[PDB]
Short mmCIF file of N, CA and C in Angstrom, two decimals:
data_model
loop_
_atom_site.label_atom_id
_atom_site.label_comp_id
_atom_site.label_asym_id
_atom_site.label_seq_id
_atom_site.Cartn_x
_atom_site.Cartn_y
_atom_site.Cartn_z
N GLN O 1 -0.37 5.45 -18.99
CA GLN O 1 -0.58 4.01 -19.14
C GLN O 1 0.50 3.13 -18.49
N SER O 2 1.77 3.45 -18.75
CA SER O 2 2.87 2.61 -18.30
C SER O 2 4.13 3.42 -17.94
N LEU O 3 4.18 3.93 -16.71
CA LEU O 3 5.35 4.66 -16.20
C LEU O 3 5.67 4.28 -14.77
N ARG O 4 6.93 3.92 -14.53
CA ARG O 4 7.35 3.46 -13.21
C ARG O 4 8.75 3.95 -12.83
N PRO O 5 8.82 4.90 -11.87
CA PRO O 5 10.03 5.50 -11.29
C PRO O 5 11.01 4.51 -10.61
N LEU O 6 12.15 4.26 -11.25
CA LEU O 6 13.22 3.43 -10.69
C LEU O 6 14.46 4.26 -10.35
N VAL O 7 14.87 4.24 -9.08
CA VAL O 7 16.02 5.04 -8.65
C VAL O 7 17.26 4.19 -8.36
N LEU O 8 18.40 4.56 -8.96
CA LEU O 8 19.68 3.96 -8.60
C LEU O 8 20.39 4.83 -7.58
N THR O 9 20.27 4.42 -6.32
CA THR O 9 20.72 5.20 -5.18
C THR O 9 22.04 4.67 -4.59
N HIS O 10 22.92 5.57 -4.17
CA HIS O 10 24.20 5.17 -3.59
C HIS O 10 24.97 6.36 -3.05
N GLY O 11 25.43 6.25 -1.80
CA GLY O 11 26.26 7.27 -1.17
C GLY O 11 25.77 8.70 -1.38
N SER O 12 26.30 9.36 -2.40
CA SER O 12 25.93 10.74 -2.73
C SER O 12 25.57 10.95 -4.21
N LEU O 13 25.39 9.85 -4.94
CA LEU O 13 25.01 9.91 -6.35
C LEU O 13 23.80 9.03 -6.66
N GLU O 14 22.85 9.59 -7.41
CA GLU O 14 21.63 8.88 -7.78
C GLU O 14 21.33 9.01 -9.27
N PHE O 15 20.61 8.03 -9.80
CA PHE O 15 20.09 8.13 -11.15
C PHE O 15 18.63 7.69 -11.22
N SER O 16 17.78 8.54 -11.79
CA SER O 16 16.36 8.23 -11.94
C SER O 16 16.04 7.56 -13.29
N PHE O 17 14.98 6.76 -13.30
CA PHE O 17 14.70 5.88 -14.42
C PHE O 17 13.21 5.81 -14.74
N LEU O 18 12.88 5.61 -16.01
CA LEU O 18 11.49 5.36 -16.40
C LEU O 18 11.31 3.95 -16.96
N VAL O 19 10.38 3.23 -16.36
CA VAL O 19 10.20 1.80 -16.61
C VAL O 19 8.75 1.52 -17.00
N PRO O 20 8.53 0.53 -17.89
CA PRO O 20 7.14 0.07 -18.08
C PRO O 20 6.56 -0.48 -16.78
N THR O 21 5.27 -0.22 -16.55
CA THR O 21 4.56 -0.72 -15.37
C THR O 21 4.76 -2.23 -15.21
N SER O 22 4.63 -2.94 -16.33
CA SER O 22 4.82 -4.38 -16.40
C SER O 22 6.21 -4.81 -15.92
N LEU O 23 7.25 -4.33 -16.61
CA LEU O 23 8.63 -4.73 -16.32
C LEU O 23 9.26 -3.87 -15.24
N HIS O 24 8.58 -3.72 -14.11
CA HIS O 24 9.11 -2.90 -13.03
C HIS O 24 9.71 -3.67 -11.85
N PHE O 25 9.34 -4.94 -11.68
CA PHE O 25 9.98 -5.74 -10.64
C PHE O 25 11.18 -6.55 -11.15
N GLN O 26 11.26 -6.77 -12.46
CA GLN O 26 12.47 -7.35 -13.02
C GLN O 26 13.58 -6.32 -12.86
N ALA O 27 13.22 -5.07 -13.12
CA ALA O 27 14.15 -3.94 -13.00
C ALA O 27 14.39 -3.55 -11.54
N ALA O 28 13.42 -3.85 -10.67
CA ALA O 28 13.61 -3.68 -9.23
C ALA O 28 14.60 -4.71 -8.70
N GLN O 29 14.49 -5.95 -9.17
CA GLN O 29 15.38 -7.06 -8.75
C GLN O 29 16.86 -6.88 -9.11
N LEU O 30 17.11 -6.49 -10.35
CA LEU O 30 18.46 -6.26 -10.81
C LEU O 30 19.08 -5.09 -10.05
N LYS O 31 18.27 -4.07 -9.76
CA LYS O 31 18.71 -2.93 -8.98
C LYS O 31 19.02 -3.33 -7.54
N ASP O 32 18.16 -4.18 -6.98
CA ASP O 32 18.27 -4.58 -5.57
C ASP O 32 19.56 -5.36 -5.27
N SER O 33 19.75 -6.47 -5.97
CA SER O 33 20.93 -7.31 -5.74
C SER O 33 22.19 -6.62 -6.22
N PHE O 34 22.02 -5.54 -6.98
CA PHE O 34 23.14 -4.76 -7.51
C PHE O 34 23.66 -3.73 -6.51
N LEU O 35 22.78 -3.29 -5.61
CA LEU O 35 23.15 -2.31 -4.59
C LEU O 35 23.75 -3.03 -3.37
N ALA O 36 23.94 -4.33 -3.52
CA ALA O 36 24.66 -5.15 -2.55
C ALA O 36 26.03 -5.56 -3.12
N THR O 37 26.13 -5.58 -4.45
CA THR O 37 27.39 -5.83 -5.15
C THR O 37 28.40 -4.74 -4.82
N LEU O 38 27.89 -3.54 -4.56
CA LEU O 38 28.72 -2.39 -4.20
C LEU O 38 29.08 -2.45 -2.71
N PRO O 39 30.26 -1.93 -2.35
CA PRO O 39 30.67 -1.94 -0.94
C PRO O 39 30.00 -0.78 -0.21
N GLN O 40 29.92 -0.86 1.11
CA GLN O 40 29.33 0.19 1.93
C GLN O 40 29.68 1.59 1.41
N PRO O 41 28.66 2.44 1.21
CA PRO O 41 28.83 3.77 0.60
C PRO O 41 29.87 4.62 1.33
N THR O 42 30.50 5.52 0.59
CA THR O 42 31.48 6.42 1.17
C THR O 42 31.09 7.88 0.92
N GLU O 43 30.86 8.61 2.02
CA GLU O 43 30.47 10.02 1.97
C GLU O 43 31.68 10.91 1.67
N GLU O 44 32.84 10.26 1.51
CA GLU O 44 34.07 10.91 1.08
C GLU O 44 34.12 10.94 -0.45
N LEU O 45 33.02 10.51 -1.05
CA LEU O 45 32.73 10.70 -2.48
C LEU O 45 33.47 9.76 -3.46
N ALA O 46 34.17 8.75 -2.95
CA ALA O 46 34.81 7.77 -3.82
C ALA O 46 35.39 6.59 -3.05
N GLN O 47 35.43 5.44 -3.71
CA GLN O 47 36.14 4.27 -3.22
C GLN O 47 37.05 3.74 -4.33
N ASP O 48 38.14 3.06 -3.95
CA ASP O 48 39.02 2.46 -4.95
C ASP O 48 38.32 1.31 -5.71
N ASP O 49 38.16 1.50 -7.02
CA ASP O 49 37.51 0.54 -7.91
C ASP O 49 36.04 0.26 -7.61
N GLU O 50 35.38 1.25 -7.00
CA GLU O 50 33.93 1.26 -6.80
C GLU O 50 33.40 2.53 -7.49
N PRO O 51 32.10 2.85 -7.33
CA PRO O 51 31.61 4.02 -8.09
C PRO O 51 32.41 5.32 -7.84
N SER O 52 32.55 6.13 -8.90
CA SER O 52 33.24 7.42 -8.85
C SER O 52 32.37 8.56 -9.39
N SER O 53 31.45 8.23 -10.29
CA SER O 53 30.54 9.21 -10.88
C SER O 53 29.15 8.58 -10.99
N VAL O 54 28.18 9.34 -11.48
CA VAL O 54 26.85 8.80 -11.79
C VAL O 54 26.93 8.01 -13.10
N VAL O 55 27.93 8.32 -13.93
CA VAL O 55 28.16 7.61 -15.19
C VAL O 55 28.63 6.17 -14.94
N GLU O 56 29.12 5.93 -13.73
CA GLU O 56 29.60 4.61 -13.31
C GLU O 56 28.52 3.76 -12.64
N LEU O 57 27.52 4.41 -12.06
CA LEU O 57 26.40 3.71 -11.44
C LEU O 57 25.58 2.99 -12.50
N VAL O 58 25.38 3.66 -13.62
CA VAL O 58 24.61 3.09 -14.72
C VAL O 58 25.45 2.08 -15.50
N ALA O 59 26.71 2.43 -15.73
CA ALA O 59 27.64 1.54 -16.41
C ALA O 59 27.81 0.21 -15.66
N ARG O 60 27.97 0.29 -14.34
CA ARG O 60 28.09 -0.90 -13.50
C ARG O 60 26.82 -1.75 -13.53
N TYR O 61 25.69 -1.07 -13.69
CA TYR O 61 24.40 -1.74 -13.72
C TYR O 61 24.14 -2.38 -15.08
N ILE O 62 24.61 -1.74 -16.15
CA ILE O 62 24.42 -2.24 -17.52
C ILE O 62 25.12 -3.57 -17.72
N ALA O 63 26.30 -3.71 -17.12
CA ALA O 63 27.08 -4.94 -17.21
C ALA O 63 26.58 -5.96 -16.20
N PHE O 64 26.02 -5.47 -15.10
CA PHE O 64 25.42 -6.34 -14.10
C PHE O 64 24.25 -7.12 -14.71
N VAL O 65 23.35 -6.38 -15.35
CA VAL O 65 22.17 -6.97 -15.98
C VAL O 65 22.53 -7.82 -17.18
N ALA O 66 23.38 -7.28 -18.05
CA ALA O 66 23.77 -7.95 -19.28
C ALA O 66 24.52 -9.25 -18.99
N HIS O 67 25.07 -9.35 -17.79
CA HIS O 67 25.72 -10.57 -17.34
C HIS O 67 24.68 -11.63 -16.94
N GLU O 68 23.58 -11.19 -16.33
CA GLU O 68 22.50 -12.09 -15.91
C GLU O 68 21.60 -12.51 -17.06
N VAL O 69 21.79 -11.90 -18.23
CA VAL O 69 21.13 -12.32 -19.46
C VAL O 69 21.83 -13.56 -20.02
N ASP O 70 23.15 -13.48 -20.11
CA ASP O 70 23.97 -14.58 -20.63
C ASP O 70 24.22 -15.64 -19.56
N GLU O 71 23.95 -15.29 -18.31
CA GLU O 71 23.99 -16.26 -17.23
C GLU O 71 22.79 -17.19 -17.38
N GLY O 72 22.94 -18.45 -16.95
CA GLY O 72 21.92 -19.47 -17.15
C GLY O 72 20.67 -19.39 -16.28
N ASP O 73 20.07 -18.20 -16.19
CA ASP O 73 18.82 -17.97 -15.44
C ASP O 73 17.61 -18.07 -16.37
N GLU O 74 16.96 -19.23 -16.38
CA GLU O 74 15.93 -19.50 -17.37
C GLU O 74 14.54 -19.02 -16.94
N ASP O 75 13.61 -19.05 -17.89
CA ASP O 75 12.24 -18.58 -17.68
C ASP O 75 12.19 -17.06 -17.49
N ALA O 76 13.36 -16.46 -17.29
CA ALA O 76 13.46 -15.02 -17.06
C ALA O 76 14.36 -14.34 -18.08
N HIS O 77 14.59 -15.01 -19.21
CA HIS O 77 15.42 -14.43 -20.26
C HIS O 77 14.73 -13.34 -21.10
N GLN R 1 3.52 -14.53 -22.08
CA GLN R 1 2.26 -13.89 -21.69
C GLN R 1 2.17 -13.56 -20.20
N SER R 2 2.47 -14.55 -19.35
CA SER R 2 2.26 -14.41 -17.91
C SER R 2 3.31 -15.18 -17.08
N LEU R 3 4.46 -14.55 -16.86
CA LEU R 3 5.53 -15.13 -16.04
C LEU R 3 6.18 -14.09 -15.13
N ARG R 4 6.25 -14.39 -13.84
CA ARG R 4 6.78 -13.44 -12.86
C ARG R 4 7.63 -14.11 -11.77
N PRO R 5 8.96 -13.87 -11.82
CA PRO R 5 9.97 -14.37 -10.88
C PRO R 5 9.77 -13.93 -9.42
N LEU R 6 9.36 -14.86 -8.56
CA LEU R 6 9.24 -14.64 -7.11
C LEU R 6 10.30 -15.41 -6.31
N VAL R 7 11.13 -14.69 -5.55
CA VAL R 7 12.19 -15.34 -4.78
C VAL R 7 11.92 -15.37 -3.27
N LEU R 8 12.02 -16.56 -2.68
CA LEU R 8 11.99 -16.69 -1.22
C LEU R 8 13.42 -16.71 -0.67
N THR R 9 13.84 -15.56 -0.19
CA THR R 9 15.22 -15.33 0.22
C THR R 9 15.37 -15.33 1.74
N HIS R 10 16.46 -15.91 2.24
CA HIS R 10 16.73 -15.98 3.68
C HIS R 10 18.12 -16.54 4.00
N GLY R 11 18.87 -15.82 4.83
CA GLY R 11 20.19 -16.25 5.27
C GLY R 11 21.08 -16.80 4.16
N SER R 12 21.04 -18.13 3.99
CA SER R 12 21.86 -18.81 2.98
C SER R 12 21.05 -19.78 2.11
N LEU R 13 19.73 -19.71 2.21
CA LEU R 13 18.85 -20.57 1.42
C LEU R 13 17.78 -19.76 0.68
N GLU R 14 17.60 -20.07 -0.61
CA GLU R 14 16.62 -19.37 -1.44
C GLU R 14 15.76 -20.36 -2.22
N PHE R 15 14.56 -19.92 -2.59
CA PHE R 15 13.72 -20.67 -3.52
C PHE R 15 13.08 -19.77 -4.58
N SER R 16 13.25 -20.15 -5.84
CA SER R 16 12.71 -19.38 -6.95
C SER R 16 11.32 -19.88 -7.36
N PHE R 17 10.52 -18.97 -7.91
CA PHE R 17 9.10 -19.22 -8.13
C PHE R 17 8.62 -18.66 -9.47
N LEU R 18 7.63 -19.31 -10.07
CA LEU R 18 6.97 -18.75 -11.25
C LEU R 18 5.50 -18.42 -10.98
N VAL R 19 5.15 -17.17 -11.27
CA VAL R 19 3.87 -16.60 -10.87
C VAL R 19 3.17 -16.00 -12.09
N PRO R 20 1.83 -16.06 -12.13
CA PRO R 20 1.14 -15.28 -13.16
C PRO R 20 1.42 -13.79 -12.99
N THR R 21 1.54 -13.08 -14.11
CA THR R 21 1.75 -11.64 -14.11
C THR R 21 0.71 -10.92 -13.25
N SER R 22 -0.54 -11.34 -13.40
CA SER R 22 -1.66 -10.81 -12.64
C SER R 22 -1.47 -10.97 -11.13
N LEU R 23 -1.34 -12.22 -10.68
CA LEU R 23 -1.26 -12.54 -9.26
C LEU R 23 0.16 -12.47 -8.72
N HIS R 24 0.86 -11.37 -8.99
CA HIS R 24 2.24 -11.27 -8.57
C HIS R 24 2.45 -10.38 -7.35
N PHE R 25 1.51 -9.49 -7.06
CA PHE R 25 1.65 -8.68 -5.85
C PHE R 25 0.91 -9.28 -4.65
N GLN R 26 -0.05 -10.16 -4.91
CA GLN R 26 -0.63 -10.93 -3.82
C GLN R 26 0.44 -11.88 -3.28
N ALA R 27 1.20 -12.46 -4.21
CA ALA R 27 2.29 -13.37 -3.87
C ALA R 27 3.52 -12.61 -3.37
N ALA R 28 3.67 -11.35 -3.78
CA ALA R 28 4.71 -10.49 -3.24
C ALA R 28 4.40 -10.14 -1.78
N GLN R 29 3.14 -9.84 -1.50
CA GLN R 29 2.70 -9.47 -0.14
C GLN R 29 2.88 -10.58 0.90
N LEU R 30 2.46 -11.79 0.54
CA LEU R 30 2.55 -12.94 1.44
C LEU R 30 4.02 -13.26 1.71
N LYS R 31 4.85 -13.10 0.68
CA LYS R 31 6.29 -13.28 0.81
C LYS R 31 6.89 -12.21 1.73
N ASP R 32 6.43 -10.97 1.57
CA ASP R 32 7.00 -9.82 2.27
C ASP R 32 6.80 -9.88 3.79
N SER R 33 5.54 -9.97 4.21
CA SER R 33 5.23 -10.04 5.63
C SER R 33 5.69 -11.37 6.23
N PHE R 34 6.02 -12.33 5.37
CA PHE R 34 6.47 -13.65 5.80
C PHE R 34 7.97 -13.68 6.12
N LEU R 35 8.72 -12.78 5.48
CA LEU R 35 10.16 -12.68 5.71
C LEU R 35 10.44 -11.78 6.92
N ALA R 36 9.36 -11.38 7.59
CA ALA R 36 9.45 -10.66 8.85
C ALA R 36 9.02 -11.59 10.00
N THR R 37 8.22 -12.60 9.66
CA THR R 37 7.80 -13.65 10.59
C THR R 37 9.00 -14.44 11.08
N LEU R 38 10.01 -14.53 10.22
CA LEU R 38 11.25 -15.22 10.55
C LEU R 38 12.18 -14.31 11.35
N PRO R 39 13.00 -14.90 12.24
CA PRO R 39 13.93 -14.09 13.03
C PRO R 39 15.17 -13.76 12.20
N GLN R 40 15.88 -12.71 12.59
CA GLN R 40 17.11 -12.30 11.91
C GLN R 40 17.91 -13.52 11.44
N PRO R 41 18.28 -13.53 10.15
CA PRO R 41 18.97 -14.68 9.53
C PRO R 41 20.25 -15.07 10.25
N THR R 42 20.61 -16.35 10.15
CA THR R 42 21.82 -16.86 10.78
C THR R 42 22.74 -17.52 9.76
N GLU R 43 23.92 -16.94 9.60
CA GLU R 43 24.90 -17.42 8.65
C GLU R 43 25.59 -18.67 9.19
N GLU R 44 25.18 -19.08 10.39
CA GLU R 44 25.63 -20.32 11.01
C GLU R 44 24.74 -21.46 10.54
N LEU R 45 23.85 -21.12 9.61
CA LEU R 45 23.08 -22.09 8.82
C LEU R 45 21.87 -22.73 9.53
N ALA R 46 21.52 -22.27 10.73
CA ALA R 46 20.34 -22.78 11.43
C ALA R 46 20.01 -21.98 12.67
N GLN R 47 18.72 -21.95 13.00
CA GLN R 47 18.23 -21.41 14.26
C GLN R 47 17.28 -22.42 14.90
N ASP R 48 17.13 -22.38 16.22
CA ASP R 48 16.22 -23.29 16.90
C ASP R 48 14.76 -22.96 16.56
N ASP R 49 14.08 -23.92 15.93
CA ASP R 49 12.68 -23.79 15.50
C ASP R 49 12.40 -22.68 14.47
N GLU R 50 13.43 -22.35 13.69
CA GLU R 50 13.33 -21.47 12.52
C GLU R 50 13.80 -22.28 11.29
N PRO R 51 13.96 -21.64 10.11
CA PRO R 51 14.30 -22.48 8.94
C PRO R 51 15.57 -23.33 9.11
N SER R 52 15.56 -24.55 8.57
CA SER R 52 16.71 -25.46 8.63
C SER R 52 17.13 -25.93 7.23
N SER R 53 16.18 -25.94 6.30
CA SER R 53 16.45 -26.34 4.92
C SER R 53 15.67 -25.41 3.98
N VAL R 54 15.79 -25.63 2.67
CA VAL R 54 14.95 -24.92 1.70
C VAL R 54 13.54 -25.54 1.69
N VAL R 55 13.44 -26.80 2.13
CA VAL R 55 12.16 -27.50 2.23
C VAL R 55 11.29 -26.90 3.32
N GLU R 56 11.92 -26.14 4.21
CA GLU R 56 11.23 -25.50 5.33
C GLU R 56 10.80 -24.07 5.01
N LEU R 57 11.50 -23.43 4.07
CA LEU R 57 11.15 -22.07 3.65
C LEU R 57 9.83 -22.07 2.91
N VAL R 58 9.63 -23.08 2.08
CA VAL R 58 8.38 -23.23 1.34
C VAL R 58 7.26 -23.77 2.24
N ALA R 59 7.59 -24.75 3.07
CA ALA R 59 6.62 -25.31 4.01
C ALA R 59 6.09 -24.24 4.97
N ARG R 60 6.98 -23.41 5.49
CA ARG R 60 6.61 -22.31 6.38
C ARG R 60 5.73 -21.28 5.67
N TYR R 61 5.97 -21.13 4.37
CA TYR R 61 5.23 -20.18 3.55
C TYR R 61 3.85 -20.74 3.18
N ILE R 62 3.77 -22.05 2.95
CA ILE R 62 2.51 -22.70 2.58
C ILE R 62 1.47 -22.58 3.70
N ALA R 63 1.93 -22.69 4.94
CA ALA R 63 1.03 -22.60 6.09
C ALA R 63 0.78 -21.14 6.44
N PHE R 64 1.73 -20.28 6.09
CA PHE R 64 1.58 -18.85 6.31
C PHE R 64 0.44 -18.31 5.47
N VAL R 65 0.45 -18.65 4.18
CA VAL R 65 -0.58 -18.22 3.24
C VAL R 65 -1.92 -18.89 3.51
N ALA R 66 -1.89 -20.21 3.70
CA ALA R 66 -3.10 -20.99 3.94
C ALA R 66 -3.81 -20.56 5.22
N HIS R 67 -3.07 -19.93 6.11
CA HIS R 67 -3.63 -19.36 7.34
C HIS R 67 -4.36 -18.04 7.06
N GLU R 68 -3.84 -17.25 6.12
CA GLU R 68 -4.45 -15.97 5.74
C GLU R 68 -5.63 -16.14 4.79
N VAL R 69 -5.84 -17.37 4.32
CA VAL R 69 -7.03 -17.72 3.54
C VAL R 69 -8.21 -17.91 4.49
N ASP R 70 -8.00 -18.72 5.52
CA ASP R 70 -9.02 -18.99 6.53
C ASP R 70 -9.14 -17.86 7.54
N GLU R 71 -8.16 -16.95 7.55
CA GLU R 71 -8.23 -15.74 8.36
C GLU R 71 -9.22 -14.78 7.72
N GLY R 72 -9.89 -13.98 8.54
CA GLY R 72 -10.98 -13.14 8.07
C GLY R 72 -10.59 -11.92 7.25
N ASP R 73 -9.72 -12.12 6.26
CA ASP R 73 -9.30 -11.04 5.36
C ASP R 73 -10.15 -11.05 4.08
N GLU R 74 -11.16 -10.18 4.03
CA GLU R 74 -12.14 -10.21 2.95
C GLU R 74 -11.73 -9.41 1.70
N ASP R 75 -12.49 -9.59 0.62
CA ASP R 75 -12.21 -8.96 -0.66
C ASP R 75 -10.94 -9.50 -1.29
N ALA R 76 -10.17 -10.25 -0.51
CA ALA R 76 -8.90 -10.79 -0.97
C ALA R 76 -8.86 -12.30 -0.85
N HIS R 77 -10.03 -12.93 -0.73
CA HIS R 77 -10.07 -14.39 -0.61
C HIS R 77 -9.85 -15.14 -1.93
#
């Protein structure tokens, strides 16, 4: 009924996600502008104060989204 | 019940949109092929006979869509 594959892709680390069919472009949007917040990927497997693990890709995204909740973006709360 | 964030993004000018949940991929499609109609963005804030304001991003899109209405694209009228 409602399953939508969302991938958090970067350099050499990825995280897969399951999303409601409905809320799949809100989650696409936060992912999209978030993969620009990060600096050009490094195949040397790390950057200073950028992602270091897959645990950091999700953590960075959790605060990214949670910031846009408290940010004054209306009609989309 | 029915709200869907559509963004018209380009260079340094954007326009946000509210769309019915239903009619959100028809509006995604017209937006998508329309952001290819435009030439590579200019951070110098203008191109000759390309977008100059945010009033032009929507105007260019209004005629883009209204052209595909009168264009012979059936089942999608």
